[PDB]
Design a protein around this ligand. Structure first.
Ligand SMILES: [Cl-]
Length: 418
């Protein structure tokens, strides 16, 4: 007889802070809009078994049992005080919950020519306010499933020490960074152990190191370890804003307006510039917008080239003093890259911060072959459709786009790239 598994996702705060701020933004501005997200496994030679699938089915259902506790809501009000009152009331209500049975469509398919091996098919669809939170916990669960049931050639030895060493190097180089690895963690336990390592590093020289650790994107771990939760706007914000009525020409400005009108200009945070290409973004990035945002988040393309472009914009076009604004580098970082990019930022008169994700929470060697990498699962859950319209991303890697090709072509034309 089957015994029910212990739920892995024990809190609606076991997620990235950007999910909650998006949730507040979507609730506030677009409570009616409907969306679909889609899972994609970019590592398609990595496959699933029946055991993993059955555990996933169970774990997904448990998401429907979660509620924000009193202490959790208090934590949100304290650390994210600019969340609107009405949003807090909405998530505080006894009416609030996730409905995975209605929102998640999870099937699996035996792979042609690979019997006993399966690919996952996952669509998450419904009102945007009902669907926005699933991305992170679903990814966190799928990764955990894969390393629990499919690839077990690995263990936890030296995970804390490895994270500690990374953190110590970063701190010696005066690097201001946050942990950002929730979505691709090998397991909840893996992320907890790396949090332990980072804090062990901090507490070796807290007078110096406390101010270098910005915090973690994971609100639950921020709460647990007594550090700040860290978040920015995500791509899905301007993608949704554009797709609602397919006004791409004004989407960057409309998205900033809406963000600012929701949280307040002072709480605008870092701007994500590359969604429809950084050039389009820059056309509207002047006062008051460029004064409200405290900087920009770099998420694609060549980081050094990005840094030069942004520096010229701020210092030459906008006539701001050097070191007025931040670039946050967040695309597949490791310690050596963070150091290199910190140099480029300094050279170009920019303050630098870093979000370090998968390298923290999914850096494992094989147990069988300790010199060989145990590869992470390269999975995403991406916004696909909004009110029936295609959702797309251009990025700054200009021929590496996301979404319906015809739409991407049409948009590049409308925005003057082509
Ligand atoms: Cl898959």
């Amino acid at each position: 007889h089957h015994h029910m598994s212990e739920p892995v996702i024990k809190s609606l705060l076991d997620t990235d802070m950007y999910k909650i701020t998006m949730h507040a933004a979507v609730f506030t501005n677009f409570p009616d809009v409907t969306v679909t997200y889609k899972y994609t496994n970019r590592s398609s030679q990595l496959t699933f078994n029946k055991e993993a699938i059955n555990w996933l089915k169970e774990q997904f259902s448990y998401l429907g049992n979660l509620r924000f506790t009193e202490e959790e809501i208090e934590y949100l009000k304290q650390e994210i005080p600019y969340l609107p009152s009405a949003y807090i009331k909405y998530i505080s209500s006894s009416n609030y919950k996730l409905h995975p049975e209605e929102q998640i469509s999870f099937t699996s398919e035996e792979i042609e020519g690979k019997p006993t091996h399966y690919k996952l098919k996952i669509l998450v669809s419904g009102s945007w306010k009902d669907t926005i939170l699933y991305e992170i916990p679903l990814l966190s669960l799928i990764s955990e499933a894969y390393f629990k049931f499919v690839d077990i050639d690995w263990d936890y030895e030296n995970q804390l020490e490895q994270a500690e060493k990374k953190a110590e190097t970063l701190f010696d180089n005066g690097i201001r960074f946050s942990e950002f690895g929730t979505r691709r963690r090998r397991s909840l336990k893996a992320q907890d152990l790396i949090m332990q390592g980072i804090m062990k590093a901090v507490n070796g020289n807290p007078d110096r190191n406390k101010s270098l650790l910005l915090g973690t994107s994971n609100i639950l771990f921020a709460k647990k370890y007594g550090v700040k939760p860290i978040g920015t706007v995500a791509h899905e914000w301007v993608m949704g804003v554009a797709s609602i009525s397919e006004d791409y020409l004004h989407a960057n400005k409309n998205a900033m307006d809406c963000w600012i009108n929701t949280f307040g200009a002072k709480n605008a945070g870092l701007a994500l510039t590359d969604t429809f290409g950084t050039d389009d973004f820059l056309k509207s990035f002047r006062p008051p917008y460029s004064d409200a945002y405290v900087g920009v988040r770099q998420d694609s393309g060549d980081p050094v080239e990005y840094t030069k472009k942004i520096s010229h914009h701020y210092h030459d076009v906008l006539k701001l003093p050097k070191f007025s604004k931040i670039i946050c580098y967040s695309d597949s970082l490791n310690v050596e890259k963070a150091i290199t990019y910190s140099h480029a930022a300094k050279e170009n008169g920019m303050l630098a911060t870093f979000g370090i994700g998968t390298n923290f929470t999914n850096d494992f060697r094989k147990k069988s072959e300790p010199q060989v990498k145990s590869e992470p699962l390269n999975i995403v859950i991406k916004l696909l459709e909004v009110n029936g319209n295609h959702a797309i991303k251009i990025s700054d890697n200009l021929g590496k786009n996301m979404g319906d090709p015809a739409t991407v072509k049409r948009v590049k034309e409308e925005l003057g790239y082509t």
